[PDB]
């Protein structure tokens, strides 16, 4: 059982440097290839480089040569990724992955392919400063007071960095709920809305509240949405 | 510098169906070291096949891989609900490893027209000097949808952004939001704000609108 645990989310300014860690446990550390793969929001996987702990044999992708340094401490079964001269283009979730092993067990001959993956580490590269979002109601239309469905929501605008979580009625309401992918506006801030469809007959009797949480700024907002 | 090509980038298939995904390499992939991965939204990738055709323990047998040289294929005998996701192929035949751009397998289902809603900016936002107008396309299929903003019947372009959710796990539909952002001053300059939607499920375009401050 190979488990990889990565360090927490990071927020860096362009030009700065970041170091993400990956602690392995549940197998041998030294004799197995460990790589770093990244994925930008909504994009594909990109292999960055890797290292074989035993002799710190690193292998870097040409595209990163000079900006990337991958290390590994056999004493703590921990591998590291250091990326310098950060640029907004480096904003992404970084994963460490270890190759799998033949058949059963884990002491078999390595297979090269990545069978074990860490949880991922979101690294954001921006000049923006930490900011909690403003929450605005998306008031249900008066054009649909009776007959059919009614839609209401919350506009969560101008926050940084990701992520933010949204719930409805403290999590009691989950059906018909849609929380859209955040969009990075030219202002350097994120924005998104959360909507929910409910029976219109329910507008005059059920209270609707969207709970917005933005841990990065220790912000929590509960906003009531009504006609 | 092996370039991997996966096409189509998207395939629409019914459940229980068979699926075959392609992966072309610019040059021969050393020792047929080709691998396939599955990635569901919000989750890390998962190894399905390595060595072009070896299935690792813990991976259902409905997953099979084949090919050699520069042509390779992943096959899913029968698509279970959990099999609809993105699939990436990677080649590790040389020190510089690479991935394909991925092929996404969505659930093909019957056409469902979106239910359209439009929301005016809240008075609470206007006060800050900004006006966000939101248009919502709820639970529709297929994915393709055209949302046009019209202010006083004048077509808008460049001042709106949209975002779509991932295919719903339960009904396999999509939902979309379109946000028109204006300065408070610009918002105050017009009367009628409307959102016009065109979609396979709609015989004729649907328009939702409101009169500012009405």
């Amino acid at each position: 059982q190979v488990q990889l645990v990565q360090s927490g989310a990071e927020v860096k300014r362009p030009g700065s440097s970041v170091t993400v860690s990956c602690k392995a446990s549940g197998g041998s550390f030294s004799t197995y290839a460990l790589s770093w793969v990244r994925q930008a929001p909504g994009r594909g996987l990109e292999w960055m480089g890797g290292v074989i702990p035993l002799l710190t044999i690193t292998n870097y992708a040409p595209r990163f040569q000079g900006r990337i340094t991958i290390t590994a401490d056999r004493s703590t079964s921990t591998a590291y990724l250091e990326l310098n001269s950060l640029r907004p283009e480096d904003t992404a979730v970084y994963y460490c992955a270890r190759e799998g092993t033949t058949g059963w067990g884990w002491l078999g001959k390595p297979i090269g392919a990545f069978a074990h993956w860490g949880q991922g580490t979101l690294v954001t590269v921006s000049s923006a400063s930490t900011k909690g979002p403003s929450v605005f109601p998306l008031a249900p239309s008066s054009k649909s007071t009776s007959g059919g469905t009614a839609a209401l929501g919350c506009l969560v605008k101008d926050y940084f960095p990701e992520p933010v979580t949204v719930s409805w009625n403290s999590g009691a309401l989950t059906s018909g709920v849609h929380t859209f992918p955040a969009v990075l506006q030219s202002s350097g801030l994120y924005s998104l809305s959360s909507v929910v469809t409910v029976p219109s007959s329910s507008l005059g009797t059920q209270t609707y509240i969207c709970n917005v949480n933005h841990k990065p700024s220790n912000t929590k907002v509960d906003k009531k949405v009504e006609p | 510098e092996i370039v991997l090509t996966q096409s189509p980038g998207t395939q629409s298939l019914s459940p229980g169906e068979r699926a075959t995904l392609s992966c072309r390499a610019s040059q021969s992939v050393g020792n047929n070291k080709l691998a396939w991965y599955q990635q569901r939204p919000g989750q890390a990738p998962r190894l399905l096949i390595y060595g072009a055709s070896s299935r690792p323990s813990g991976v259902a047998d409905r997953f099979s891989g084949s090919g050699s040289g520069t042509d390779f294929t992943l096959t899913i005998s029968r698509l279970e609900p959990e099999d609809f996701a993105v699939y990436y192929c990677q080649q590790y035949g040389q020190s510089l490893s690479t991935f394909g751009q991925g092929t996404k397998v969505e659930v093909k289902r019957t056409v469902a027209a979106p239910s359209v809603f439009i929301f005016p900016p809240s008075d609470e936002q206007l006060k800050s000097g900004t006006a966000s107008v939101v248009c919502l396309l709820n639970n529709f299929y297929p994915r393709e949808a055209k949302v046009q903003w019209k202010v006083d019947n004048a077509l808008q372009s460049g001042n709106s952004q949209e975002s779509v959710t991932e295919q719903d796990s339960k009904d396999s539909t999509y939902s979309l939001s379109s946000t028109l952002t204006l300065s408070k001053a610009d918002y105050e300059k017009h009367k009628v704000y409307a959102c016009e939607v065109t979609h396979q499920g709609l015989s004729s375009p649907v328009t939702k609108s409101f009169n500012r401050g009405e």
Binding site: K109, P110 | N31, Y92, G93
Partner: peptide
């Protein structure tokens, strides 16, 4: 090929 090294190390020991 770098992705072959652990295989060779494993064989050299095995």
């Amino acid at each position: 090929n770098w992705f072959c090294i652990t295989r060779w190390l494993w064989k050299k020991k095995k």
